[model samples]
Target: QFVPADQAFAFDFQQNQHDLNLTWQIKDGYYLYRKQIRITPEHAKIADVQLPQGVWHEDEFYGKSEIYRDRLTLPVTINQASAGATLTVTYQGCADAGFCYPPETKTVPLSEVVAN
Candidate 1:
């Protein structure tokens, strides 16, 4: 038996004028595939996305790979996105117990504060 997709992971984000900060909280016993993370913005150009380093892992399905455990924060930059626009994030993960989750897509609104 495996845990539910939404129940095994949580998501959050902070949106500034043109930069954004996204976070993923992975439950214990689970990890996210580093190469499977993606971000797309509506009506905006994805200038860059800064992803932190993940640990080396040998997955059962994908063989050698990089995976993130616990939590990961991503810094992203975009251009020309207007108010009410949206950004979508996609990711896939698996549990240490030999269970994998399908690609999960999450959408976030482009409204939030910036931190100093």
Candidate 2:
């Protein structure tokens, strides 16, 4: 059996607002938990991350061992206003077939979209 995975994120910096959108796409027969995901600069305050009310999913396993795509949008407030900055995101998840891979961390640079 073969398992495939892909993750993509987009960052936009506008005036005093910083927006981050992330998407995780996995192949059939795999699951990624929410707990396994982490965003660094943990100090960076987040305004919100869209999820069902009172229902939080863990990075353990999804429903019934089936592959599903999930997305997270993080609205952050930066301490310092700058034209460019790097945002780091870390995540770890497992496969239903009883195999876990090392945690992965990715850094993304945010660029100014428009000046206010």
- The candidate maximizing lDDT is 1
Worst 10 residues of 1 by lDDT: 107-116
TM-scores of the models, in the given order? 0.86, 0.54
Against the true structure, what is every candidate's RMSD?
Answer: 3.3, 6.1
Rate residue 20 of model 2 by lDDT.
Answer: 54
Name the regions of candidate 1 deviating beyond 4 angstroms: 112-116
TM-score for candidate 1, residues paired by index: 0.86
- Total clashes, candidate 1? 0
Candidate 1 lDDT (Cα, 0 to 1)? 0.82
Itemize residue pairs with steric clashes in candidate 2.
33-58, 33-59, 34-58, 34-59, 35-59
lDDT tens per residue, model 2, 15-115? 24455555555544444455556665432434444432223334343443322243334445444334555567676555546665566776756544332
TM-score of 2: 0.54
- Give the top-scoring candidate (TM-score): 1
The whole-model lDDT of each prediction reads: 0.82, 0.46
